[model samples]
Target chain A: LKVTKAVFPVAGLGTRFLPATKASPKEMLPIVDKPLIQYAVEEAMAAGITEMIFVTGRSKRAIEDHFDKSYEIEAELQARGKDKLLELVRSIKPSHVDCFYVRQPEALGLGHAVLCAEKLVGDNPFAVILADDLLYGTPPVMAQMIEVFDHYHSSVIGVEEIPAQETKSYGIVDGKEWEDSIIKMSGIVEKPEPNVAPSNLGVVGRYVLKPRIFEHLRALKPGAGGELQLTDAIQSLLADEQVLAYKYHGTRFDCGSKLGYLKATVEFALRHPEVAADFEEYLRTRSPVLEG
Target chain B: LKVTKAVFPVAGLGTRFLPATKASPKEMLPIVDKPLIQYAVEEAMAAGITEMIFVTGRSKRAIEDHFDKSYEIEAELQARGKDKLLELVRSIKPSHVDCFYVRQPEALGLGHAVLCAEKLVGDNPFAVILADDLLYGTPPVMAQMIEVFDHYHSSVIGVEEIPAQETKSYGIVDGKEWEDSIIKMSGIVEKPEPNVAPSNLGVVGRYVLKPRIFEHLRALKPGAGGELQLTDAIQSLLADEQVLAYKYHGTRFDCGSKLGYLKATVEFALRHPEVAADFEEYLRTRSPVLEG
Candidate 1:
């Protein structure tokens, strides 16, 4: 089935960014001029995902306002004659992709947020992207995942190789190193003990789940921190069918954390078209003593 | 009287920023890690101004939230043990300064917004900083203005030399060139015709005003664009007082516009201590074209 929809679970409060994220949603935290959410949305768009279902929570109104049309703001831009800035806003919503929202009434786990969108995403093989994970690459990270999904028709989750000792910190996959980038998963472990870890293949923020995964998610029991664990649902889905944890080529930034967010901001700013040249010149010229 | 308080007229809709300022106030827009209003506030603080009275408008709750303490967020950072990010949040509020606020109630003008703080800034000279202007230098631009006010016992407005043809776009100072940096103003012309412009000393965002200026602002009538002009109030104050259009030594960024905001962002990010080294490294290596 064609992957026509994508689910974005943005309900989690970005507790890591502190005062900066207190009023603003973590997903809305900017990396350069664009927010992390925009990166995720645009990536999903690149994967031929036309419908973006955002499972948003309270204080997440900014996300909706960002994607929605604003009469006054558009008029103001026209009044000021800021053609470049106005062009950015105009292209915020392209003709192909339509943005939709479903309020995650309570702060729930990732599985629950995905479950909230069952009606809209019914029977459609869809993509899921975590806003916190800002993946940057060409052909796009999600595009790479969808490429594998087209042939397999099986569930695919983006995975990366981390240090074997550090596998305890991530959702480790108990799977065979099937191909150059694909992992045929037997099961998944949510942050396994370092000594007893299954494999170093860790699941990242991007997912290409089959429609069959929803049934497992809907029936998912409370586990890991008493939240509906998406890993638990994936484990159950594996019982009926094969799922591949695909290692995609990209740089994944955990933007929910301060270090990762700042790193992403710097990296993005370095490549920005408007300020790249001047920004490069300024960075090398500015002194650490001056930064103080 | 000493200038101990600053009235930051942040009530403007910031039409230049448009979609970025649709829901959030433009003052809350970040130039690197700090917002424009924070820069204005800190500049006032550095100039020995203890009080920051923000004349705000509708839908500007984000600005207040940006400065105020967030207990939940603070505790979350502590729980996560993010000391560096915690340090940033803790230092956002300094002990010596107090932030006060008043609503503008209407989209009047700069003069009316400054007049709104009349009750709070009673019987004292105060500073007025338009939040859109981001000035950086040694001693700071506002500090330079305050120094001139110290010697003259007169109203001091920050001025910069612009091209002769660009004089028509600003309130030009018609005055004797007193010192290298100070313009002893006889009067000011608001957006004078290019041929009729008296001088190239263009008015900026910083001002050190005496309490006597309030009497002029209070009796002001709506003039250009059907709004009470701050320039007109300064013109009236000039009749009884010697207002100095002091040229300050600094790089002033008119961050009200998109290009200016982006330029300030790149410039500040280059100087940011936490990420400057890595940022500079990335910029140089990212592109051969940019490196040159």
Candidate 2:
């Protein structure tokens, strides 16, 4: 089945960004000109996902308003004759796409969030994109993973090679390359010790999940802190189907942390066409940090 | 009289920020880790001001909440053992200082905002800081201006020399040097044409104003937009009082516009001690703008 819908899990409390995220959702934190969730949403749009389903929690009203049509804002921009900004506001949601939202009552794990959107997503295969794991590529990361799913007709998880020692921080995939950069995933391990881990490819947040994942997620036992972990659900799904581990051709940033968020801001600012030349010039000649 | 209070006029609609400022006030826009208003408040605190008065509009509730104590956020950070972030939150408001709010009720000019704070400001001289004009200096700009007010026993306005041709864009000053970097102001012209401008010195946002100006503000006539102009009141104050113009040693960035805001963010990031070294290193080695 072709993937025509995407699920965005935006229920996390974002405790790390406390005070900053106290009133606003963490996904609303802007990188350069756009928010984190906006970047992820645009990526999905580019990859031909026409339906956007957001799994939300408390303090997530901003996310709902962000994607909805901003009537007063559009009128104000038009009256002021700021056509460029008006176009930017108008383009936030394309006319061809539709948006649906489902609220997760509690702060459960990622697998729980996916289950909340089961009814809205129906029986079709859908992509799940985490707003925190920001990725950059010429062709979006999801587009690449969807191509892999088209050929193999299985759940494809985006993975990037991590340092051997850092396997303790991520879910490690066990497999070998069936094709150039695609792995036939046999099993997945959750935060295993470096020596015990089978491979160095660590799973990221992008996934082209088949609808069958709902069944395994429903029966999945809770992990530590009574949370149903997504990785555990994936491990169980491995027994019934072939899940591919995709070495996505892109750079991934863990925007969940403060330093990583700042790094992403800088990189994205430089790549922004309007500010790139002047910002690069500022870096070379006028940066206060480099001045005596 | 010595300056003991500060007035922050945050009543503007901030139309330039558009969709970004639609729900959130432009003053809440973050430069690095802290918002623009916080920077101005800290500068006022550094200058020995005790009472902080804010003239706010309808959608500026976030500003009040930001200054008030965040019990939930503080408890969460403490429970998570994030002492550094906890300290940052705790230090937003000092014990000795108090915050007071006054609603402007209209988009009146700067003088109207000051007049609204008359009851709270009493008869003493007070400092006026516009958060939009973000300034960086050794001793805070207000402290420097307070010192000038003490010596001359008169009002002092912060001025910086602009390009000769750009005088028409700013409130031009007519003055002669009374001391080094200090001018005895004769009169002030609001947005004078290039040829008729008296000098290149343009008024910045920092001001140490005597309470006597309140009378002039109350008696002032409406300007172009049916709004009371602060410059007109200041020009009237020049009739009986000698207002001084201080060419303060500092750098000022207008955070009201988009490009200026981005420039301020970059400069502040470079000066921020925690991110300076690493951010500068990234610029030198890994910046995508500089990368081929």
User: Highest lDDT among the candidates is held by which one?
Assistant: 2
- The window of 10 residues in a row where model 2 chain A has the poorest summed lDDT is A283-292
Q: Candidate 2: where is the Cα deviation over 4 Å?
A: A11-19, A56-58, A69-81, A95-109, A223-225, A287-292, B11-22, B57-61, B70-83, B101-124, B223-225, B287-292
Q: What is the lDDT of candidate 2?
A: 0.80
**Model 2 per-residue lDDT tens digits across residues A89-184:** 667777898989898876667888998898988899999999888888768999888888898999999998999999999999998789889998
Clashes of each: 0, 0
> Which residue pairs collide in model 1, if any?
none
In the range B197-268, model 2's lDDT, one tens digit per residue, is 999999998999999989999898776545788999999999888999999887887878655667787787
Q: Report RMSD for candidate 2.
A: 3.5
Predicted structure 1: lDDT: 0.78
Per-prediction TM-score, please?
A: 0.81, 0.87
Model 2 alpha-carbon miss at residue A279, Å = 1.7
In order, candidate lDDTs are 0.78, 0.80
